[PDB]
Amino acid sequence: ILGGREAEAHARPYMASVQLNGAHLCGGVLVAEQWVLSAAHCLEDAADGKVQVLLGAHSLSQPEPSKRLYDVLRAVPHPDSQPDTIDHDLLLLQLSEKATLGPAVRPLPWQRVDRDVAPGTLCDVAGWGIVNHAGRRPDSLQHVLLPVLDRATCNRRTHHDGAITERLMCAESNRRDSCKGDSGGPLVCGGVLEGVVTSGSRVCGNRKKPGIYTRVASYAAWIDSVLA
Ligand SMILES: COC(=O)c1ccccc1CNC(=O)N1CCC[C@H]1C(=O)Nc1cccc(OC(F)(F)F)c1
């Protein structure tokens, strides 16, 4: 997260760290007792590597009573996802068992009505991604409040030049933004999951290159199918 602040410990009990070989790789969001939603590019070339999900965390390295590392039974990338595209960039991870729920571990309600979030809505994005241009990695969860950017402005030649489909949304990236390592994390608006940070490489904190988030409402039937 660039231009953000340290999050209040355990105030976002749905927040997951998706780890590969014991290191934070991507953000994720607990959407059901046994399922974490993240981004499909997260597990590219991860083939053989150990994927785990850390729930109930604030610090990645310090002991906390609510912290629990879960193994993953199945990793389900969206079938239409591809390495060279930003489309259908979703991944569902089935945990080894249902998560132990409590004040610090709880699934987030997610948007099932396919209607756009109004431009200007203030949404929250959290993650353990880089915090500066040198690549400094925070030990604790960071967050930033970002206003939603209308799709037509996001699609201008100066911005993302027509790449923003109806299944994607944008948020302003003016010195405050999601960055490397925040991919897969949640974009929460009015206490409901609206988007998942995309995992394509992009410059951070440059107002001319808005943040791109996959709209979960646009994938409600796929999310339901996988869990079933
Ligand atoms: C919104 O995303 C952007 O704007 C963005 C801007 C540049 C490169 C990339 C991105 C977004 N893509 C990712 O993050 N991806 C792609 C899938 C894997 C994941 C990644 O690379 N994980 C990672 C790797 C090393 C260290 C690390 O940990 C920490 F982050 F702590 F360093 C995390």
Side-chain angles (χ1 to χ4, degrees), residues 69-131:
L69 195 60
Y70 290 81
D71 287 310
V72 172
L73 179 65
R74 288 202 273 159
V76 188
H78 191 287
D80 294 302
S81 62
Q82 284 182 90
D84 285 326
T85 71
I86 68 171
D87 309 302
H88 323 306
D89 191 19
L90 294 181
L91 171 65
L92 275 162
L93 300 171
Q94 192 184 13
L95 306 179
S96 56
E97 58 182 335
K98 291 179 185 91
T100 298
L101 308 185
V105 182
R106 182 77 48 189
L108 180 62
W110 60 272
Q111 189 59 259
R112 295 169 157 279
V113 175
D114 193 8
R115 279 200 291 270
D116 281 334
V117 178
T121 302
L122 207 65
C123 305
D124 185 70
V125 66
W128 290 270
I130 70 172
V131 297

Short mmCIF file of all heavy atoms in Angstrom, two decimals, residues 69-131:
data_model
loop_
_atom_site.label_atom_id
_atom_site.label_comp_id
_atom_site.label_asym_id
_atom_site.label_seq_id
_atom_site.Cartn_x
_atom_site.Cartn_y
_atom_site.Cartn_z
N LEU A 69 -2.19 -20.37 10.50
CA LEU A 69 -1.78 -20.71 9.14
C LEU A 69 -2.52 -21.94 8.71
O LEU A 69 -2.51 -22.98 9.40
CB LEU A 69 -0.26 -20.94 9.11
CG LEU A 69 0.47 -20.97 7.77
CD1 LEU A 69 0.32 -19.65 7.00
CD2 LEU A 69 1.94 -21.24 8.00
N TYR A 70 -3.22 -21.82 7.60
CA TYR A 70 -3.97 -22.91 7.03
C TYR A 70 -3.31 -23.42 5.77
O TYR A 70 -2.86 -22.65 4.90
CB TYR A 70 -5.39 -22.43 6.66
CG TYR A 70 -6.26 -22.15 7.85
CD1 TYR A 70 -6.17 -20.93 8.54
CD2 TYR A 70 -7.09 -23.14 8.38
CE1 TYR A 70 -6.97 -20.67 9.65
CE2 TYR A 70 -7.89 -22.88 9.50
CZ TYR A 70 -7.78 -21.67 10.17
OH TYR A 70 -8.54 -21.47 11.29
N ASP A 71 -3.33 -24.75 5.62
CA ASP A 71 -2.93 -25.35 4.38
C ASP A 71 -4.13 -25.21 3.40
O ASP A 71 -5.27 -24.94 3.81
CB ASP A 71 -2.61 -26.82 4.64
CG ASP A 71 -1.29 -26.95 5.37
OD1 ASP A 71 -0.31 -26.32 4.92
OD2 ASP A 71 -1.26 -27.63 6.42
N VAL A 72 -3.83 -25.35 2.12
CA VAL A 72 -4.80 -25.23 1.05
C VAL A 72 -5.06 -26.62 0.44
O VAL A 72 -4.11 -27.26 -0.03
CB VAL A 72 -4.27 -24.21 0.01
CG1 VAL A 72 -5.15 -24.18 -1.25
CG2 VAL A 72 -4.21 -22.80 0.64
N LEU A 73 -6.31 -27.03 0.41
CA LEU A 73 -6.74 -28.32 -0.17
C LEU A 73 -6.80 -28.21 -1.69
O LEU A 73 -6.39 -29.14 -2.39
CB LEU A 73 -8.11 -28.69 0.42
CG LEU A 73 -8.80 -29.97 -0.03
CD1 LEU A 73 -8.01 -31.19 0.38
CD2 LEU A 73 -10.19 -30.06 0.57
N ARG A 74 -7.37 -27.09 -2.20
CA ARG A 74 -7.51 -26.86 -3.64
C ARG A 74 -7.31 -25.40 -3.95
O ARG A 74 -7.80 -24.56 -3.20
CB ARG A 74 -8.97 -27.14 -4.07
CG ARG A 74 -9.37 -28.57 -4.09
CD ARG A 74 -10.54 -28.65 -5.01
NE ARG A 74 -11.78 -28.38 -4.31
CZ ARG A 74 -12.90 -28.00 -4.91
NH1 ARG A 74 -12.91 -27.77 -6.22
NH2 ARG A 74 -14.01 -27.82 -4.20
N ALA A 75 -6.64 -25.12 -5.06
CA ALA A 75 -6.47 -23.77 -5.61
C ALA A 75 -7.24 -23.79 -6.92
O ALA A 75 -6.95 -24.63 -7.79
CB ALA A 75 -5.02 -23.48 -5.87
N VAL A 76 -8.27 -22.93 -7.04
CA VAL A 76 -9.16 -22.89 -8.20
C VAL A 76 -9.05 -21.51 -8.90
O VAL A 76 -9.79 -20.59 -8.55
CB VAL A 76 -10.61 -23.21 -7.79
CG1 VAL A 76 -11.51 -23.38 -9.03
CG2 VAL A 76 -10.67 -24.48 -6.91
N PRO A 77 -8.21 -21.40 -9.93
CA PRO A 77 -8.18 -20.15 -10.70
C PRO A 77 -9.37 -20.09 -11.63
O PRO A 77 -9.90 -21.12 -12.07
CB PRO A 77 -6.86 -20.24 -11.47
CG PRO A 77 -6.60 -21.73 -11.62
CD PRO A 77 -7.31 -22.43 -10.49
N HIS A 78 -9.84 -18.87 -11.93
CA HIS A 78 -10.94 -18.72 -12.87
C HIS A 78 -10.55 -19.39 -14.21
O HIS A 78 -9.46 -19.14 -14.70
CB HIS A 78 -11.29 -17.25 -13.12
CG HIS A 78 -12.56 -17.08 -13.87
ND1 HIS A 78 -12.66 -17.37 -15.22
CD2 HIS A 78 -13.77 -16.75 -13.40
CE1 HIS A 78 -13.93 -17.17 -15.53
NE2 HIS A 78 -14.64 -16.80 -14.46
N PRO A 79 -11.43 -20.24 -14.79
CA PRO A 79 -11.05 -20.95 -16.03
C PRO A 79 -10.71 -20.08 -17.23
O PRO A 79 -10.04 -20.58 -18.13
CB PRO A 79 -12.25 -21.82 -16.34
CG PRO A 79 -13.15 -21.77 -15.18
CD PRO A 79 -12.76 -20.63 -14.29
N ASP A 80 -11.17 -18.83 -17.25
CA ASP A 80 -10.91 -17.93 -18.38
C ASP A 80 -9.70 -17.03 -18.12
O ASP A 80 -9.37 -16.21 -18.96
CB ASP A 80 -12.15 -17.12 -18.74
CG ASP A 80 -13.28 -17.97 -19.27
OD1 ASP A 80 -13.08 -18.67 -20.29
OD2 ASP A 80 -14.33 -18.02 -18.62
N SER A 81 -9.05 -17.17 -16.94
CA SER A 81 -7.87 -16.36 -16.67
C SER A 81 -6.70 -16.81 -17.55
O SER A 81 -6.63 -17.99 -17.94
CB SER A 81 -7.50 -16.41 -15.20
OG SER A 81 -7.18 -17.73 -14.80
N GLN A 82 -5.81 -15.85 -17.90
CA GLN A 82 -4.66 -16.11 -18.77
C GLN A 82 -3.47 -15.30 -18.30
O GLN A 82 -3.66 -14.20 -17.81
CB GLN A 82 -4.99 -15.67 -20.20
CG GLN A 82 -5.92 -16.60 -20.97
CD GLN A 82 -6.12 -16.08 -22.37
OE1 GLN A 82 -5.38 -16.42 -23.29
NE2 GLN A 82 -7.11 -15.23 -22.54
N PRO A 83 -2.23 -15.81 -18.48
CA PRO A 83 -1.05 -15.04 -18.03
C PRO A 83 -0.89 -13.62 -18.58
O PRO A 83 -0.43 -12.75 -17.86
CB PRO A 83 0.13 -15.90 -18.48
CG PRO A 83 -0.41 -17.28 -18.61
CD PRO A 83 -1.85 -17.13 -19.02
N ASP A 84 -1.27 -13.39 -19.83
CA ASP A 84 -1.04 -12.07 -20.42
C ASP A 84 -2.25 -11.15 -20.42
O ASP A 84 -2.31 -10.20 -21.23
CB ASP A 84 -0.47 -12.21 -21.84
CG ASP A 84 1.00 -12.62 -21.90
OD1 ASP A 84 1.77 -12.21 -21.01
OD2 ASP A 84 1.37 -13.34 -22.86
N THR A 85 -3.24 -11.39 -19.53
CA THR A 85 -4.40 -10.51 -19.52
C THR A 85 -4.76 -10.15 -18.10
O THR A 85 -4.38 -10.85 -17.18
CB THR A 85 -5.65 -11.15 -20.16
OG1 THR A 85 -6.14 -12.18 -19.30
CG2 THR A 85 -5.44 -11.66 -21.57
N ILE A 86 -5.53 -9.07 -17.93
CA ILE A 86 -6.01 -8.66 -16.63
C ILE A 86 -7.43 -9.20 -16.36
O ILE A 86 -8.00 -8.92 -15.31
CB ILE A 86 -5.93 -7.11 -16.47
CG1 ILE A 86 -6.95 -6.38 -17.40
CG2 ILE A 86 -4.47 -6.61 -16.66
CD1 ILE A 86 -7.07 -4.83 -17.13
N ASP A 87 -8.02 -9.92 -17.33
CA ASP A 87 -9.39 -10.35 -17.23
C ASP A 87 -9.59 -11.62 -16.42
O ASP A 87 -8.75 -12.52 -16.43
CB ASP A 87 -10.01 -10.50 -18.63
CG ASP A 87 -9.79 -9.25 -19.50
OD1 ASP A 87 -10.22 -8.14 -19.09
OD2 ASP A 87 -9.09 -9.36 -20.53
N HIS A 88 -10.73 -11.69 -15.71
CA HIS A 88 -11.10 -12.90 -14.95
C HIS A 88 -10.00 -13.29 -13.94
O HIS A 88 -9.75 -14.49 -13.69
CB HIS A 88 -11.40 -14.07 -15.91
CG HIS A 88 -12.10 -13.63 -17.17
ND1 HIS A 88 -13.28 -12.91 -17.11
CD2 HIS A 88 -11.69 -13.69 -18.45
CE1 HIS A 88 -13.58 -12.59 -18.37
NE2 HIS A 88 -12.67 -13.06 -19.21
N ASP A 89 -9.42 -12.26 -13.31
CA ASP A 89 -8.26 -12.47 -12.45
C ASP A 89 -8.62 -12.84 -11.03
O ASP A 89 -8.29 -12.13 -10.05
CB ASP A 89 -7.33 -11.26 -12.51
CG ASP A 89 -5.97 -11.45 -11.87
OD1 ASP A 89 -5.55 -12.61 -11.68
OD2 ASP A 89 -5.31 -10.43 -11.58
N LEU A 90 -9.29 -13.96 -10.89
CA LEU A 90 -9.75 -14.42 -9.58
C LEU A 90 -9.30 -15.83 -9.31
O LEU A 90 -9.13 -16.64 -10.23
CB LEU A 90 -11.27 -14.38 -9.51
CG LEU A 90 -11.93 -12.99 -9.57
CD1 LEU A 90 -13.39 -13.13 -9.46
CD2 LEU A 90 -11.46 -12.08 -8.42
N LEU A 91 -9.10 -16.12 -8.01
CA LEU A 91 -8.61 -17.40 -7.52
C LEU A 91 -9.33 -17.73 -6.26
O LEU A 91 -9.42 -16.89 -5.35
CB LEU A 91 -7.11 -17.19 -7.20
CG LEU A 91 -6.38 -18.32 -6.49
CD1 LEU A 91 -6.34 -19.54 -7.41
CD2 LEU A 91 -4.98 -17.90 -6.14
N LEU A 92 -9.85 -18.95 -6.15
CA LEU A 92 -10.46 -19.39 -4.92
C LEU A 92 -9.61 -20.45 -4.27
O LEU A 92 -9.20 -21.41 -4.95
CB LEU A 92 -11.88 -19.90 -5.16
CG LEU A 92 -12.90 -18.79 -5.16
CD1 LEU A 92 -14.18 -19.24 -5.84
CD2 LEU A 92 -13.18 -18.27 -3.74
N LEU A 93 -9.28 -20.25 -3.02
CA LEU A 93 -8.47 -21.21 -2.27
C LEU A 93 -9.33 -21.87 -1.21
O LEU A 93 -9.93 -21.19 -0.37
CB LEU A 93 -7.31 -20.47 -1.58
CG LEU A 93 -6.39 -19.73 -2.52
CD1 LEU A 93 -5.42 -18.84 -1.75
CD2 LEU A 93 -5.57 -20.67 -3.37
N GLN A 94 -9.45 -23.21 -1.30
CA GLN A 94 -10.19 -23.97 -0.31
C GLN A 94 -9.22 -24.35 0.79
O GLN A 94 -8.23 -25.03 0.54
CB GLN A 94 -10.79 -25.24 -0.92
CG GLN A 94 -11.80 -25.90 0.03
CD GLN A 94 -12.31 -27.21 -0.56
OE1 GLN A 94 -11.75 -27.74 -1.52
NE2 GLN A 94 -13.41 -27.69 -0.01
N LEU A 95 -9.49 -23.89 2.00
CA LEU A 95 -8.64 -24.20 3.14
C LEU A 95 -8.77 -25.69 3.50
O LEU A 95 -9.82 -26.31 3.22
CB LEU A 95 -9.03 -23.35 4.37
CG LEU A 95 -9.08 -21.82 4.13
CD1 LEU A 95 -9.50 -21.16 5.40
CD2 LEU A 95 -7.75 -21.32 3.60
N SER A 96 -7.73 -26.20 4.19
CA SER A 96 -7.60 -27.58 4.68
C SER A 96 -8.78 -27.98 5.56
O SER A 96 -9.07 -29.16 5.66
CB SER A 96 -6.32 -27.72 5.49
OG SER A 96 -6.35 -26.75 6.52
N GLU A 97 -9.40 -27.01 6.26
CA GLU A 97 -10.58 -27.17 7.10
C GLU A 97 -11.22 -25.81 7.23
O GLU A 97 -10.59 -24.81 6.91
CB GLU A 97 -10.26 -27.76 8.48
CG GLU A 97 -9.27 -26.96 9.29
CD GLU A 97 -8.96 -27.62 10.62
OE1 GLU A 97 -9.81 -28.38 11.14
OE2 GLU A 97 -7.85 -27.38 11.14
N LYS A 98 -12.45 -25.79 7.71
CA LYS A 98 -13.14 -24.55 7.98
C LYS A 98 -12.33 -23.74 8.99
O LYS A 98 -11.78 -24.29 9.96
CB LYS A 98 -14.55 -24.81 8.53
CG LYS A 98 -15.50 -25.41 7.52
CD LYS A 98 -16.88 -25.68 8.10
CE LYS A 98 -17.76 -26.39 7.09
NZ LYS A 98 -17.68 -27.87 7.21
N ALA A 99 -12.25 -22.43 8.76
CA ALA A 99 -11.51 -21.56 9.64
C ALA A 99 -12.20 -21.47 11.00
O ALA A 99 -13.44 -21.45 11.07
CB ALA A 99 -11.45 -20.16 9.03
N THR A 100 -11.39 -21.37 12.05
CA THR A 100 -11.91 -21.11 13.40
C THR A 100 -12.29 -19.62 13.41
O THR A 100 -11.41 -18.75 13.26
CB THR A 100 -10.85 -21.41 14.45
OG1 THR A 100 -10.53 -22.79 14.38
CG2 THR A 100 -11.33 -21.04 15.89
N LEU A 101 -13.57 -19.34 13.57
CA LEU A 101 -14.07 -17.96 13.58
C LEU A 101 -14.03 -17.34 14.94
O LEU A 101 -14.07 -18.06 15.95
CB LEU A 101 -15.48 -17.83 12.98
CG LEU A 101 -15.69 -18.46 11.59
CD1 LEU A 101 -17.07 -18.15 11.07
CD2 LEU A 101 -14.63 -17.98 10.56
N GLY A 102 -13.91 -16.02 14.97
CA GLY A 102 -13.86 -15.27 16.22
C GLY A 102 -13.79 -13.80 15.91
O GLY A 102 -13.89 -13.41 14.74
N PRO A 103 -13.56 -12.94 16.91
CA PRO A 103 -13.53 -11.50 16.62
C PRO A 103 -12.47 -11.10 15.60
O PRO A 103 -12.64 -10.07 14.93
CB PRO A 103 -13.24 -10.87 17.99
CG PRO A 103 -13.78 -11.86 18.96
CD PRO A 103 -13.51 -13.21 18.36
N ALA A 104 -11.38 -11.89 15.46
CA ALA A 104 -10.31 -11.56 14.53
C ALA A 104 -10.31 -12.36 13.23
O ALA A 104 -9.45 -12.12 12.37
CB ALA A 104 -8.95 -11.65 15.21
N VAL A 105 -11.26 -13.30 13.07
CA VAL A 105 -11.36 -14.15 11.88
C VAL A 105 -12.83 -14.30 11.54
O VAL A 105 -13.57 -15.01 12.24
CB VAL A 105 -10.67 -15.55 12.00
CG1 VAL A 105 -10.79 -16.32 10.66
CG2 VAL A 105 -9.20 -15.45 12.44
N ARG A 106 -13.27 -13.65 10.46
CA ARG A 106 -14.68 -13.71 10.09
C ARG A 106 -14.81 -13.43 8.58
O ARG A 106 -14.15 -12.52 8.07
CB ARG A 106 -15.45 -12.60 10.86
CG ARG A 106 -16.97 -12.54 10.63
CD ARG A 106 -17.78 -13.59 11.37
NE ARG A 106 -17.44 -13.70 12.79
CZ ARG A 106 -17.90 -14.65 13.59
NH1 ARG A 106 -18.73 -15.58 13.13
NH2 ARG A 106 -17.53 -14.69 14.87
N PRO A 107 -15.63 -14.19 7.85
CA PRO A 107 -15.80 -13.88 6.43
C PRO A 107 -16.48 -12.53 6.21
O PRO A 107 -17.24 -12.06 7.07
CB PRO A 107 -16.67 -15.01 5.90
CG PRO A 107 -16.62 -16.11 6.98
CD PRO A 107 -16.45 -15.35 8.27
N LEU A 108 -16.18 -11.91 5.09
CA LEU A 108 -16.75 -10.62 4.73
C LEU A 108 -17.93 -10.86 3.80
O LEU A 108 -17.75 -11.50 2.76
CB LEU A 108 -15.68 -9.80 3.98
CG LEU A 108 -16.08 -8.39 3.50
CD1 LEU A 108 -16.42 -7.47 4.70
CD2 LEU A 108 -14.89 -7.77 2.77
N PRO A 109 -19.09 -10.20 4.05
CA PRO A 109 -20.18 -10.25 3.05
C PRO A 109 -19.72 -9.66 1.72
O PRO A 109 -18.95 -8.67 1.73
CB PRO A 109 -21.26 -9.36 3.66
CG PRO A 109 -20.96 -9.34 5.12
CD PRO A 109 -19.46 -9.37 5.21
N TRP A 110 -20.11 -10.29 0.62
CA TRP A 110 -19.65 -9.86 -0.69
C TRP A 110 -20.81 -9.55 -1.61
O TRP A 110 -21.91 -10.09 -1.46
CB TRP A 110 -18.63 -10.85 -1.26
CG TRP A 110 -19.14 -12.24 -1.44
CD1 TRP A 110 -19.13 -13.26 -0.53
CD2 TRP A 110 -19.61 -12.79 -2.66
NE1 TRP A 110 -19.59 -14.42 -1.13
CE2 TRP A 110 -19.93 -14.15 -2.43
CE3 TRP A 110 -19.86 -12.25 -3.93
CZ2 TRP A 110 -20.43 -14.97 -3.43
CZ3 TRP A 110 -20.36 -13.06 -4.93
CH2 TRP A 110 -20.67 -14.40 -4.67
N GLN A 111 -20.57 -8.61 -2.53
CA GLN A 111 -21.59 -8.10 -3.42
C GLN A 111 -22.07 -9.07 -4.46
O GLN A 111 -21.29 -9.53 -5.29
CB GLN A 111 -21.06 -6.83 -4.10
CG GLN A 111 -22.14 -6.07 -4.91
CD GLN A 111 -23.29 -5.64 -4.05
OE1 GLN A 111 -24.34 -6.29 -4.05
NE2 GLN A 111 -23.11 -4.58 -3.26
N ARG A 112 -23.39 -9.36 -4.43
CA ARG A 112 -24.03 -10.30 -5.33
C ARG A 112 -24.95 -9.63 -6.37
O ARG A 112 -25.43 -10.33 -7.26
CB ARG A 112 -24.76 -11.39 -4.52
CG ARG A 112 -23.80 -12.27 -3.71
CD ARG A 112 -24.56 -13.13 -2.73
NE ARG A 112 -23.84 -14.34 -2.32
CZ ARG A 112 -23.78 -15.46 -3.02
NH1 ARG A 112 -24.33 -15.53 -4.23
NH2 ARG A 112 -23.12 -16.51 -2.55
N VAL A 113 -25.17 -8.30 -6.27
CA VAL A 113 -26.00 -7.52 -7.21
C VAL A 113 -25.03 -6.86 -8.18
O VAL A 113 -24.20 -6.07 -7.77
CB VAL A 113 -26.87 -6.49 -6.46
CG1 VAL A 113 -27.63 -5.61 -7.45
CG2 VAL A 113 -27.83 -7.18 -5.50
N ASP A 114 -25.17 -7.20 -9.46
CA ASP A 114 -24.27 -6.69 -10.47
C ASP A 114 -24.66 -5.28 -10.93
O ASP A 114 -25.28 -5.09 -11.98
CB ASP A 114 -24.17 -7.68 -11.63
CG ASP A 114 -23.03 -7.43 -12.60
OD1 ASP A 114 -22.21 -6.55 -12.33
OD2 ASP A 114 -22.96 -8.14 -13.63
N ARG A 115 -24.30 -4.30 -10.11
CA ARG A 115 -24.49 -2.88 -10.37
C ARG A 115 -23.21 -2.20 -9.92
O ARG A 115 -22.60 -2.62 -8.92
CB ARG A 115 -25.67 -2.30 -9.58
CG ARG A 115 -27.02 -2.58 -10.22
CD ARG A 115 -28.10 -1.62 -9.72
NE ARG A 115 -28.45 -1.85 -8.32
CZ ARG A 115 -29.40 -2.68 -7.91
NH1 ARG A 115 -30.10 -3.39 -8.78
NH2 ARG A 115 -29.64 -2.83 -6.61
N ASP A 116 -22.78 -1.20 -10.68
CA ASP A 116 -21.53 -0.49 -10.40
C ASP A 116 -21.56 0.30 -9.12
O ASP A 116 -22.59 0.88 -8.76
CB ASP A 116 -21.22 0.49 -11.52
CG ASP A 116 -20.61 -0.12 -12.77
OD1 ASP A 116 -19.97 -1.19 -12.66
OD2 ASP A 116 -20.80 0.47 -13.85
N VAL A 117 -20.40 0.36 -8.43
CA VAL A 117 -20.27 1.20 -7.26
C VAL A 117 -20.24 2.65 -7.82
O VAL A 117 -19.55 2.93 -8.82
CB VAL A 117 -18.96 0.88 -6.50
CG1 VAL A 117 -18.79 1.81 -5.31
CG2 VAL A 117 -18.97 -0.58 -6.04
N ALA A 118 -20.97 3.56 -7.18
CA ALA A 118 -21.00 4.93 -7.65
C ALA A 118 -19.62 5.59 -7.63
O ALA A 118 -18.86 5.47 -6.65
CB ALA A 118 -21.98 5.76 -6.84
N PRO A 119 -19.27 6.37 -8.67
CA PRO A 119 -18.01 7.12 -8.63
C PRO A 119 -17.95 8.01 -7.38
O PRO A 119 -18.98 8.56 -6.92
CB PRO A 119 -18.06 7.98 -9.89
CG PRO A 119 -18.96 7.24 -10.80
CD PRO A 119 -19.99 6.59 -9.94
N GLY A 120 -16.76 8.13 -6.83
CA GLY A 120 -16.53 8.91 -5.64
C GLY A 120 -16.74 8.18 -4.34
O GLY A 120 -16.27 8.67 -3.30
N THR A 121 -17.37 6.99 -4.37
CA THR A 121 -17.56 6.21 -3.14
C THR A 121 -16.20 5.94 -2.53
O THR A 121 -15.26 5.53 -3.23
CB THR A 121 -18.32 4.92 -3.45
OG1 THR A 121 -19.58 5.21 -4.06
CG2 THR A 121 -18.51 4.02 -2.21
N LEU A 122 -16.10 6.12 -1.22
CA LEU A 122 -14.86 5.87 -0.52
C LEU A 122 -14.78 4.41 -0.13
O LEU A 122 -15.65 3.90 0.59
CB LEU A 122 -14.73 6.78 0.73
CG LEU A 122 -13.29 7.09 1.16
CD1 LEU A 122 -12.56 7.93 0.09
CD2 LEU A 122 -13.26 7.83 2.48
N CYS A 123 -13.78 3.71 -0.68
CA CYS A 123 -13.61 2.29 -0.36
C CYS A 123 -12.27 2.05 0.29
O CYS A 123 -11.33 2.82 0.10
CB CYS A 123 -13.73 1.44 -1.61
SG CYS A 123 -15.27 1.71 -2.53
N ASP A 124 -12.16 0.95 1.01
CA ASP A 124 -10.95 0.64 1.75
C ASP A 124 -10.24 -0.54 1.14
O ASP A 124 -10.86 -1.54 0.82
CB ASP A 124 -11.33 0.28 3.19
CG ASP A 124 -10.11 0.07 4.06
OD1 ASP A 124 -9.42 1.05 4.34
OD2 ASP A 124 -9.76 -1.12 4.33
N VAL A 125 -8.92 -0.42 0.96
CA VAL A 125 -8.06 -1.49 0.46
C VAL A 125 -6.89 -1.67 1.42
O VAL A 125 -6.20 -0.70 1.78
CB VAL A 125 -7.60 -1.32 -1.00
CG1 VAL A 125 -6.69 -0.11 -1.17
CG2 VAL A 125 -6.92 -2.59 -1.52
N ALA A 126 -6.64 -2.93 1.82
CA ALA A 126 -5.64 -3.26 2.81
C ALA A 126 -4.69 -4.30 2.26
O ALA A 126 -5.03 -5.08 1.34
CB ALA A 126 -6.31 -3.75 4.10
N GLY A 127 -3.47 -4.30 2.76
CA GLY A 127 -2.50 -5.27 2.31
C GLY A 127 -1.14 -5.16 2.97
O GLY A 127 -0.82 -4.17 3.64
N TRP A 128 -0.31 -6.16 2.69
CA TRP A 128 1.07 -6.23 3.15
C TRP A 128 2.03 -5.97 1.99
O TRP A 128 3.20 -6.33 2.05
CB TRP A 128 1.33 -7.58 3.81
CG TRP A 128 0.68 -7.81 5.12
CD1 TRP A 128 1.20 -7.52 6.35
CD2 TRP A 128 -0.55 -8.51 5.36
NE1 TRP A 128 0.36 -7.96 7.34
CE2 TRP A 128 -0.73 -8.56 6.77
CE3 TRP A 128 -1.52 -9.10 4.53
CZ2 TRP A 128 -1.83 -9.20 7.36
CZ3 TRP A 128 -2.62 -9.72 5.13
CH2 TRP A 128 -2.74 -9.80 6.52
N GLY A 129 1.54 -5.31 0.93
CA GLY A 129 2.37 -4.99 -0.21
C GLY A 129 3.40 -3.91 0.06
O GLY A 129 3.41 -3.30 1.14
N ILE A 130 4.25 -3.63 -0.93
CA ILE A 130 5.31 -2.62 -0.76
C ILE A 130 4.75 -1.27 -0.42
O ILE A 130 3.66 -0.91 -0.88
CB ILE A 130 6.27 -2.59 -1.94
CG1 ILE A 130 5.62 -2.03 -3.22
CG2 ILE A 130 6.90 -3.99 -2.17
CD1 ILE A 130 6.63 -1.80 -4.41
N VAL A 131 5.54 -0.50 0.34
CA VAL A 131 5.12 0.81 0.81
C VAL A 131 5.89 1.98 0.21
O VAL A 131 5.54 3.13 0.51
CB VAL A 131 5.08 0.91 2.35
CG1 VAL A 131 4.06 -0.06 2.93
CG2 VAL A 131 6.48 0.69 2.96
#
